[PDB]
Amino acid sequence: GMTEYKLVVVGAGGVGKSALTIQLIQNHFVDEYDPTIEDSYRKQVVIDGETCLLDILDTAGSAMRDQYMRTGEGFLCVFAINNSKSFADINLYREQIKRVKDSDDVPMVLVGNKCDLPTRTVDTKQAHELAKSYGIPFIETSAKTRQGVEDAFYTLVREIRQYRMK
Numbered sequence: 001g002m003t004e005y006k007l008v009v010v011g012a013g014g015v016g017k018s019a020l021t022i023q024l025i026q027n028h029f030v031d032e033y034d035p036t037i038e039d040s041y042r043k044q045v046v047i048d049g050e051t052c053l054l055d056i057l058d059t060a061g062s063a064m065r066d067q068y069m070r071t072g073e074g075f076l077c078v079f080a081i082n083n084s085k086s087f088a089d090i091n092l093y094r095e096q097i098k099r100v101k102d103s104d105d106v107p108m109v110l111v112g113n114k115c116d117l118p119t120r121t122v123d124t125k126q127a128h129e130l131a132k133s134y135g136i137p138f139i140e141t142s143a144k145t146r147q148g149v150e151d152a153f154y155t156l157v158r159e160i161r162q163y164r165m166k
């Protein structure tokens with residue numbers, strides 16, 4: 001059969017969860033996507049010559065939250081490079097996912113979004129060290145320019161693929 005990967009995009013409000021997801025799906029940049037919108041997609045894609053079903057959930061910032069954390073197989077942990085609080089929040093999101101999953105090994109990718117912006121308050125060295133501390137990849141993205149957007153989602157799929165063989 002066809003392989004299925006449930007991906008969940010998490011992160012503080014305004015970091016670009018929706019802009020990243022809409023860029024992936026629509027190849028369009030959204031300026032004003034309502035912050036209450038939770039949008040989920042079932043889409044067939046080809047990654048590394050293997051076709052799979054991606055179930056992608058763009059979260060909006062309690063019983064339902066634990067529900068989509070239980071169901072999610074890999075998590076895009078998004079922060080914005082001009083928002084130090086969103087970067088500091090990553091460890092809280094990570095801990096909460098592991099708590100809900102009741103598992104210490106959850107596939108994740110660290111995403112630093114809005115890299116097109118001049119205002120940078122998160123040092124890339126600290127983003128690299130945070131990803132290193134977690135043992136996960138770190139990808140710099142711009143949903144405005146589409147830089148790294150496909151890489152971020154496809155990398156998470158590859159991480160789930162490796163997790164399933166362990």
Ligand SMILES: Nc1nc2c(ncn2[C@@H]2O[C@H](COP(=O)(O)OP(=O)(O)O)[C@@H](O)[C@H]2O)c(=O)[nH]1
Pocket residue numbers: 011012013014015016017018019020030031032033034035113114115116117141142143144145
């Ligand atoms: N310059 C720039 N703005 C972005 C980027 N990603 C998102 N935004 C803007 O940040 C605001 C919040 O983005 P949104 O995707 O709605 O954030 P969400 O709350 O995490 O879903 C919107 O005005 C977006 O246009 C980016 O990569 N670059």
Ligand SMILES: [Mg+2]
Pocket residue numbers: 017018019033034035036037059060
């Ligand atoms: Mg949103």
Ligand SMILES: [Mg+2]
Pocket residue numbers: 029030031032
């Ligand atoms: Mg618009």
